[PDB]
Amino acid sequence: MGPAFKEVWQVILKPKGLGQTKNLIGIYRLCLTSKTISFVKLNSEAAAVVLQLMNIRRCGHSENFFFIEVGRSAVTGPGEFWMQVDDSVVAQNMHETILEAMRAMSDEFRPR
């Protein structure tokens, strides 16, 4: 249909870099669409920042801080999306489930 997000997490954006000049902060949700991420605001209706895993340079989950380094081809551009989870479990739970989905794309992409 369209909004068939495989997994969905609820995090709280953090004012680090990209969430300061563009005003991207508050309570969002990391919806993993097995290929495209969707930062939806809990107090909204339509997706807020529909990004893609192919543009995310990398994603770190330091205990509770789950930031996502983004590079070119990013809906916002070069920068980083830091955020906070419930503790050191929701971060290690969303990083392991998101690492498998992304690994299925680059691994199931194509040889060459």
Partner: peptide, 11 residues
């Protein structure tokens, strides 16, 4: 600083 990487990023 637990960090990870993005495999589908290509680069």
């Amino acid at each position: 600083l637990v960090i990870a990487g993005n495999p589908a990023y290509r680069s």
